[PDB]
Amino acid sequence: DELFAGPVAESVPTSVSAFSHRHGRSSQKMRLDNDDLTIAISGFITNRIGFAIYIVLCVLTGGIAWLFLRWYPKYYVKLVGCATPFRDCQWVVIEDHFNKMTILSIRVKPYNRPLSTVFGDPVLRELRSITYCYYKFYYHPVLDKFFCCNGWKDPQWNSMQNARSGLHGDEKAHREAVFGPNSIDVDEQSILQLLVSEILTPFYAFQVFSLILWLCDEYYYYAAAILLISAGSIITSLLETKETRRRLREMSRFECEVRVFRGGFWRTFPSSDLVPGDVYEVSDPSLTQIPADSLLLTGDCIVNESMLTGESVAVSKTPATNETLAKLNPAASTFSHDVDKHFLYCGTKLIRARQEAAAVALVVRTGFNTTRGALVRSMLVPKPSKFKFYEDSFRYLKVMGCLAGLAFIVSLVNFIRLKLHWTLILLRALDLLTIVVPPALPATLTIGTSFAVQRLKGKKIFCTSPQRVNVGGKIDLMCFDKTGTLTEEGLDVLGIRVASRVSNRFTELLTNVDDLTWSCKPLDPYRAALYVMASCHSLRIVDGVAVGDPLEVKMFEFTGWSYEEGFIAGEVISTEGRAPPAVGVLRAFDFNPLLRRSSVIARVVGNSGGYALVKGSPECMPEICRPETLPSDFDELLSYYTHAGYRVIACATKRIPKLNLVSVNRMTRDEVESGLDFVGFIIFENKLKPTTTSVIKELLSSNIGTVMITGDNIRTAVSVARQCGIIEEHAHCYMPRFIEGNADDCNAKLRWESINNPALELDPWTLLPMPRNYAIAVTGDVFRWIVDHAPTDVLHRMLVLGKVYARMSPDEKQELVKKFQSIDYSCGFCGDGANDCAALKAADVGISLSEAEASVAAPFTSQIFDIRCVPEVIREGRASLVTSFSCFKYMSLYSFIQFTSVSFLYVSASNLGDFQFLYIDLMLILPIAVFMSWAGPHSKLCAKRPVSDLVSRKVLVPLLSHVFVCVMIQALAWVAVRQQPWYIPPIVDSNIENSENTTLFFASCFEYILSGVVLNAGRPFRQSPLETWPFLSAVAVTLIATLLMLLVPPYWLFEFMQLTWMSWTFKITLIAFGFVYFLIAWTGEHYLFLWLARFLGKQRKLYKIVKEKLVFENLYFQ
C-alpha cells in the first residue's frame, strides 16, 4: 500500500531474547516469560545467630572466609537464613536452572490505594518489590505468590474518551512509584570488588599465597615491591576500564524534551519521566526519537525501526481506533500485525509526523518493559563465569606436574645426605611452591592488555572488557548485521531508468545525475522524470535539509535542487550551469494508500503549460496509463528489480494545455489520473557504506569466514551480500522452503530451491546439488524449524554452508551464534541495534557499532560507524594473543631456570643470594617483561592464525626444549668453573659468599636477559623487534647494566652484591657462552625448535571436518 512496489516491512519488533528449543507460602517456582530461566524465589529471615557470629568468624579468620563464601553462597543461606513465608520476611534467595544463588532484599513502601492500580482489596499498604536483574517482582496480597513482572501494566484505557484526557493529580506519583522511571538505567558498577572480579585474574589467587610465604620477613623488600607493582597495574587497568564504561554510559544516556499532556495542560518534561497513561505529544519538532513505546491517538506518522527490527524501510503508523486498543496487552512479547500497525516503539528514530492540532500518543509501556528495555534487560541476565580462565586453568597443572619431577630429583638425594626432615619442607615451600607461576606473570598480562586497550582506544574503538582483547585472535569468522552495520539504515536512490520514446524500451541505470543534460515529442521523458524527482515531493523544508517521507527526501537530495516554500512559488534549478528551465508547483494531492499513488499539478516557467506529474507503484500505472508508450519490458524489468531486492516507484506525466489550464484549479484528481504517458522507473536500494566492500573482501581473503544475520527481507539480504562480497560472484543461492503443507510439525519436508532457478539441491540429508561453489540463504522460521526438528548433520551442513540469514528475530540470532559455538567454531558478532543484544554478549568478540544502543555490556564499541573497525579489533587481538603467549612462554621458563639457579646451589649446600634475586626479578625481568609486550600489530591481517592452544606441541615442546638448552649451557658453565683451576671454588658449607654462586648468577642473568629477545614473537604478527625505542632500548640498557656489573664492577656494588674477583679470560668465555646461547636459541626457535615440535607429532575442529566431507563428496559428483 506504500509508494514502492517491492519488499515490504513485515517483521514486527519482538522482545524475545532467548531461544526456547521445541520438543516433539515460601520457595515458589516460576519462569520468566521473556527469557527461559525457571527461577526459584525463596524467602528467609535472619535467625538467632545470624551475622552476629558470622562477623566475628570473618574477623578471626582474617577475612578469607568471607571472600571464599561469597563465591559459594549456597550454604551461607543454610547457615544464616531461617525458613518463613515471604509474606512477612526481609531476605530472599534467587535460584536459576543452572544452580546459581543470588541474595536480595525486600523494600517496603506504604501505598494505601486499592489493588486495581497495581494488578487486575482497597486496603493495600504493602508494596513488597524485588528488583532481580531489573525484573521487578511484586507481592500479590490476595494470593501468596510473586508475580512474573510488571510487564502487564494495568490497562484502563478502554473507554476511548479518557485515553486523550491523561493523568492528573497525585495518581502520577503512585504510578511512578509502581512502574519506576522510564529510563533504562543499569546499575553502575561498584569499585568494591564488583568490577575488580572481572579484572582479578585467578593467578592473583596464588599471589596472596606467595605473600603467606613472604609475610615472615624473609624477603622484606621483595614482597612489598611485587605487591606495589601488581597493585599499581591492577588499579590502572580497572580505573581505565571503569572510565571507559562510564564514558560509554554517559553517551548512552538519552533525555529529550516532550510536551506531556497532563492535567489538561501541555508541559515540557524530560524523557526519563513518562509513566504508563501520560498521553504525550509527537507532532512538535525536536522529537528525534520516540521516548517510550506507545499507541497512536490522532494523526499518522512515519518512523524508522531500523534498530528494533532489521527492516530498512521506514514503517508508517496510523491512529488506533477503539477496537485496536481493546485487543492488545502489554505483557505480550510479540505484538500482532493489527496492533503493530497502530503503535510507536521506544528508541526508534522518528522520521515524519503530521503538522492545538497535534499527533498525540498514549504511552503503554515504560522502563525495562519496553521492547528496547526488554532486550537490554535480557541481555544482562546470563553470565559465563568460568569460560575463559579455564584455558589457563590447566597450564599450571602440567607445570606443577613437570616441576614435581625436578622436586623429586632434588629430594631423592638431600633427604639423607645433608638435610633433616623438619627443615626440608620449608626450603621447598618458600622457594619451589611460590614459583609454580612467577609473581610477575599476572602483573605483566594486565599491563599487556592495558597496552592493547590503549592502542585500540587510539583508533576510536573503546573496550569495556579488557579480558576480551586476547579472545579476538581466536576469531575465524565474523557475523554481521545488515542495516546500520553493512548498509545504511534507509533507502537511497540508485538511478533512473527512463523509457525512450523512439525505441519503446528502457535505456540504462543512470546512477549519476545525467538526467539534466541528456535528451535522446511534446515532452522529453528525461525532463519529466527530473520534474517528478524535484517537484512531486510534498516536503516541508525547515533548515535547508528536507524532512518528510524518506523516499521524497532521497530523491530531492539526489536531484540537488532548491525547493522554496510550499505554495505557488516553486523550486529553482541549480545555478551551476551544467537549456533546462525551472518549474513551479501549483497544487499537490495527498498520497492515498487506497489509490497507491501521489499526484501533483505543476506549471513550468518556460513553456507556461500545465503539467500533471503522478508517481505511484508499478502494476497500478498500466491500468491508468496510455498503453501506446509503455515498453514491452515493463514486467521483465519489474521482476529483475524486485526479485533482486530493490524497491522501485513508477512515475508518469501528462500535459494540461493552456485552454485547459485554470488559474483557480478547482479540478478533480481523477481528470489527470487517466491517459498519462509513462517516463520511467526510480529505483531505491540499501546503499553499502563506501568502505564495507573492501573490508569484507580483505576479511574473506584473509581466511576469515563471513556470514550475515539480518532481520529484513531475504531478497534484499541476498542482493546486499552479492554486492558486498559475502557471496562470491556467479555462485547460486539456495533458499529452503517448507513443502507438503507442514511448517511447524516434526515430519515436514524442506525443498532447498535455487533462488532464481527451478534447480534444487538434494533433500536435507545431504546438501548437494543435482547434476561450482554455492551458498545457502536461510530465512528465520525455516532456521527455527531446522534447529529443533532437522537432524544434527543437516544443521551442521547448513551452518557451514550458510552465508545469509534473514528475517531473524533476536532470539534466533542468539541461537545461531550459539550454534556456531556449539561446534568448536569461534564467531564474533558485528551488531549495532537492539536486535543484536542477544547475539552480542553470547558471541566471543561482540563489536557494537552504535555508540549508545547495544553497548551497555558489549566488549567493544566503535566510534566510527563502519566495518573498518573490524580489522583492528581482530589484528590487535592477534597482536594481543601471541604476545600474551610470548609472556607465558617467557615467565614460566623464568621459573625453571630459577630452579636450576637453586638446584646447582644445593650441590654446595647454598640456596640463593638475598640481593641478586631481588636485582634479577625487579631490575631485569620487569623492564624486559612489560616492554616486550608493548608493540602494535603488523597493520596487515595475515591469513595464518596464531597458535592459540596451551595443550599443543607448538607451545610445550619449544618451552621445554628452550628450558633444556638453557640448563645444558648453565651446566656447561658450572662444569667449566668447577674444573677451572686458577681460582678454587670455595664451598664454605644461608651461605651466600660462594664464588660458584656468583659465576652461576651471572650465567643465569645472561640467560634471563637474552631469553627475552629470542622469545619475543614480534616479526610475524606484530612490529619487528628492529624498533629501537619500545623494546630494544630496554634490553640494551639492562644489558649495559649487567656488563657494568660484570666487566667493570665498582666498589659501591661490592657493598651491595656479594661478588668475588674474576679473571678477564673467564669473563670473555662467559660472554662467549651468552652469545652462543643467543645464536643457538635464535636459529632454533625460528628454524629448528618448531621443526622438532612438528616432527614429534586427531581431535580436529568440527567445522574443518565438515569442510573436508562436503568438498570430498562433491568431487565424486553427487
Ligand code: BEF
Ligand atoms: F539491523 Be541491525 F540492527 F544493524
Ligand SMILES: [Mg+2]
Ligand atoms: Mg540495524
